[PDB]
Amino acid sequence: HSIRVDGDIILGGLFPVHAKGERGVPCGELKKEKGIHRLEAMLYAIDQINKDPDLLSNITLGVRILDTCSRDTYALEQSLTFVQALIPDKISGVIGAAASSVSIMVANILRLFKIPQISYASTAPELSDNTRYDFFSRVVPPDSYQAQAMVDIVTALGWNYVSTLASEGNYGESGVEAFTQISREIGGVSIAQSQKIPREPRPGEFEKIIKRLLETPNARAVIMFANEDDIRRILEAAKKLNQSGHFLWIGSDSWGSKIAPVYQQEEIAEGAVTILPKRASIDGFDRYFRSRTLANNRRNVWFAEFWEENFGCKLCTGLERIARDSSYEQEGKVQFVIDAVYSMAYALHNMHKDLCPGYIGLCPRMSTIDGKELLGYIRAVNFNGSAGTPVTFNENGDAPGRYDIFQYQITSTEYKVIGHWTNQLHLKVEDMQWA
């Protein structure tokens, strides 16, 4: 009940195609953008490597994409499919997953069987530790650099007294913890209160959060690592308690430039500073995804379920066009998905150069690929990918801290590029606006 493509070297995939089900059920509603767009971006990238004669000459890359269902427990059970070769598909490297807690549980099982793992979205500072998850790499920067950026933004505005808000899980708690560590040890940034939002919150919890935050009234700036559904509800609760203009929101990559938490809540979201990793839209994937029909894209097992959710269809004509019959935007992490697959491909190409010299196709010396060796190749990889931007890794397996800084402004509503963070803060304070 998943995507299989035969090939010489088979690469594993982990994507949240469905959201986590309510109470009992494992899998719920289909994630159209966070699931299908990223899944199809891996299939686009793999097809491009097979098309390219220079990268892996007469060597084809295989696909084994599995659904994580937004939860770590389901992804762990799916992860065992990669290791079922040892008492049949042999998996060299796994691309995924999205969520940090999901990627942590996968990293713990893949390290023992010596399988390298490259993520496209997981940003938790815990994953950069080479003791706990030594086979983990990522094409997205760790939250150590985002928390440093947040400290830099706060200090540049003269905001010595702040409060923090976290969502339950690894991404929310450790992201705030990374901010706390930079604040406590270095400089003079004081934390008033660190409030936590539960995973399954009660109907009256978000109103209690605002009331608790108001107990330290001078702490106006709120640094937050909350999910899309959480931010929506905090700002909804803040608007209800007549707290317009009081709170100065600071959001992470989970907030980014999403219109979802700010919609019909434009007044309360005014002047909110957000940080997001440096990113561009790919027209190549856009041309690929728009030309996807139910006839040609039969290899995607979830594409039939996608067609119903996208147009309001029910299996309806079954001859619709994307970006013509329904509103279409390319997902953010798509650049990082393509750059993750190419990072794996370039490392395999570099391993082929060393182990099979003057050879076309796989040599008998590469019949069983060593994961401990291949991991070192991934870290050493340096190339221009997708956007034309360089893709690189350090010793710990992290991408460099390259960020965009946005502010939500009313003039017309937009996320205006007020600055950027690349090792050091470059922030244009002149372009900022408040209520």
- Binding residues for Cl ion (CB under 5 A): 16, 68, 97-99, 102
Interface residues for ligand HVG in 99-138 (CB under 6 A)? 99-100, 121-124
Rounded to a whole number of angstroms, the minimum distance from the CB of residue 198 to Cl ion is 20
Rounded to a whole number of angstroms, the minimum distance from the CB of residue 69 to Cl ion is 8
- Applying CB under 6 A, which of residues 48, 117, 254, 274 lies at the interface with ligand HVG? 254
Residue among 173 and 270 whose Cβ is closer to ligand HVG: 173
Instruction: Round to whole Å and give the CA distance between 226 and 2.
Output: 31
- Applying CB under 6 A, which of residues 18, 20, 34, 352 lies at the interface with ligand HVG? 34
Site string for ligand HVG, 62-81 (x = CB under 6 A): --------------------
Residue 273, contacted partner among ligand HVG, Cl ion, none, CB below 5-8 A by kind: none
Instruction: Round to whole Å and give the CA distance between 194 and 191.
Output: 7
Give Cβ neighbours of residue 7 (< 8 Å, ≥ 6 apart): 60, 61, 62, 63
Residue among 102 and 222 whose Cβ is closer to Cl ion: 102
The answer to whether 337 and 95 are in contact (CB under 8 A) is yes
Exposure b/e, 87-106, CB count within 10 A at least 16 = b: eeebbbbbbbbbbbbbbbbb
Give Cβ neighbours of residue 313 (< 8 Å, ≥ 6 apart): 307, 320
Interface residues for ligand HVG in 210-249 (CB under 6 A)? 227-228
The answer to whether 267 and 432 are in contact (CB under 8 A) is no
Instruction: Round to whole Å and give the CA distance between 389 and 368.
Output: 33
Q: What angle do CA 387, 374, 50 make, to 5 degrees?
A: 50
167 lines the binding site for ligand HVG (CB under 6 A): no
Residue among 26 and 271 whose Cβ is closer to Cl ion: 26
Rounded to a whole number of angstroms, the minimum distance from the CB of residue 252 to ligand HVG is 7
Residue among 15 and 377 whose Cβ is closer to Cl ion: 15
- Applying CB under 6 A, which of residues 171, 289, 306, 346 lies at the interface with ligand HVG? 171
Q: How many residues would you count in the chain?
A: 435
| CA atoms within 13 Å, Cβ hemisphere of 247 | 31
The answer to whether 170 and 100 are in contact (CB under 8 A) is yes
Considering only the stretches 75-83, 96-104, 368-376, 377-385, report the one whose residues sit in contact with ligand HVG under the rule CB under 6 A.
96-104
User: Which residues are near ligand HVG by CB under 6 A?
Assistant: 16, 34, 98-100, 121-124, 171, 227-228, 253-254
